[PDB]
Design a binder for this molecule. Structure first.
Ligand SMILES: CCCC[P+](CCCC)(CCCC)CCCC
Ligand SMILES: CCCC[P+](CCCC)(CCCC)CCCC
Lengths: 388, 15
């Protein structure tokens, strides 16, 4: 039978999150599981319709299709400001290679409608590569693209259990490339790994090694769109840093602020006296990213053996860098070199996780030990629920 | 999970 689901969560990364949806396995006897779901948090509203048949072949090759919509406000994600309203569709074949591996191959279409972009160097450099030349002194602008992509994926999952793993690894590799006829011309690859190594026979002392890598670039003279950038920093990547703070910072052009009021703060506003380019501490992401973490899981102090399996205590060293391979350092010698991958941020901290009756609760306290100009710290972080 | 626009990031805490 059909089912409805409604959830509410909260975290330092995304604020209050609302989730609503409907799902029906074998909807109307078609053999397709059909779902309609939406999510809303501080910076994004996302909705999707999905239809998937787990047995497109008798050997478990799956066929799935999706329709989706995204409304995103970048200032609400602690980035330099822009609005993106996007939508599209995709079709994906999933192949179970063996017990622990699956491969995915699909085709996608996506329309992106960018507007309210606050003028800044890296973003205008991408726009220029597309033949778009909006004004540098106003936030009233528009840029739309239509892209078609080939999408591929690989997931390896041999984690020993679905919650609090003590052994095994989970690896996810995702890639895509535009198909000729798309407005953009680029490729993009993301790799995530989590490996757990138990030390004791009882698996109460475990070492987790975690990595995340991202790399994308334009084909030809076009750059990868800034709306496909990678980010780092926050409760789920490099703990102890404010969400998305790591890496390049916007270099703003002097502009007349859309709704000026001397009661609020603005970046490079002409009304404040701005007549030249302004350095800032607003993150913009980058086309290259790497994160690494070593985390030592220990027994939880002053807790009962009966309720030990419900709580996880851990101590970690997190590391992260994000960079812009197309940053022109020679042209912007008076600004930090945002193309430099060696500005590795580091933090050390502790985390407490509880698989409570209501759901997963995660708290962390971490201190940056290595940071750069413009990076913002957020020592205490937490998340309640399954959305981050 | 965490979304970065339309991209997905499986958070290790969910594993
Ligand atoms: C709920 C029944 C859905 C059937 P499909 C879509 C039919 C036209 C709208 C599912 C396609 C998945 C990508 C067509 C089956 C395979 C060719
Ligand atoms: C305890 C697990 C360590 C997993 P690795 C190292 C992670 C460091 C942060 C590989 C170690 C080989 C000896 C994962 C590397 C993936 C690209």
């Amino acid at each position: 039978t059909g089912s409805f689901n409604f959830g509410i969560g909260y975290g330092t990364e995304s604020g209050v999150s609302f989730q609503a949806g409907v799902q029906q396995d074998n909807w109307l006897g078609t053999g397709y599981a059909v779902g309609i779901n939406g999510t809303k948090n501080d910076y994004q509203t996302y909705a999707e319709l999905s239809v998937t048949n787990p047995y497109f072949t008798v050997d478990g090759v799956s066929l799935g299709g999706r329709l989706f919509y995204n409304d995103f406000q970048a200032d609400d994600a602690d980035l330099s400001d822009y609005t993106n309203k996007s939508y599209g569709t995709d079709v994906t074949l999933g192949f179970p290679i063996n017990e622990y591996n699956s491969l995915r191959a699909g085709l996608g279409y996506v329309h992106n409608s960018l507007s309210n972009m606050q003028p800044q160097v890296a973003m205008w450099r991408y726009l220029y590569s597309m033949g778009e030349h909006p004004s540098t002194s106003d936030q009233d602008n528009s840029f739309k693209t239509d892209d078609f992509t080939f999408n591929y994926g690989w997931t390896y999952n041999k984690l020993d259990r679905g919650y609090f793993p003590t052994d095994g690894s989970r690896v996810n590799l995702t890639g895509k490339v535009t198909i000729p006829g798309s407005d953009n011309e680029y490729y993009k690859v993301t790799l995530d790994t989590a490996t757990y190594v138990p030390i004791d026979d009882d698996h109460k002392w475990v070492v987790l090694g975690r990595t995340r890598w991202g790399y994308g670039d334009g084909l030809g003279g076009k750059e990868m769109p800034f709306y496909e950038n990678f980010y780092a920093g926050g409760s789920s990547t490099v703990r102890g840093f404010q969400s998305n703070t790591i890496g390049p910072k916007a270099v703003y052009f002097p502009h007349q602020a859309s709704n000026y009021d001397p009661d609020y703060d603005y970046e490079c506003a002409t009304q404040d006296g701005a007549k030249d380019l302004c350095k800032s501490d607003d993150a913009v992401g980058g086309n290259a990213m790497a994160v690494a973490s070593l985390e030592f899981i220990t027994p939880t102090p002053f807790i009962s053996d009966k309720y030990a399996n419900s709580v996880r205590t851990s101590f970690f060293w997190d590391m992260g860098t994000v960079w812009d391979t197309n940053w022109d350092s020679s042209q912007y010698s008076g600004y930090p070199d945002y193309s430099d991958p060696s500005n590795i941020r580091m933090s050390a901290g502790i985390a407490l996780q509880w698989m409570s009756p209501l759901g997963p609760l995660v708290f962390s306290y971490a201190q940056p030990f290595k940071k750069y100009d413009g990076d913002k710290a957020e020592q205490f972080q937490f998340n309640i629920g399954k959305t981050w | 999970f965490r979304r970065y626009g339309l991209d997905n990031y499986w958070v290790x805490y969910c594993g």
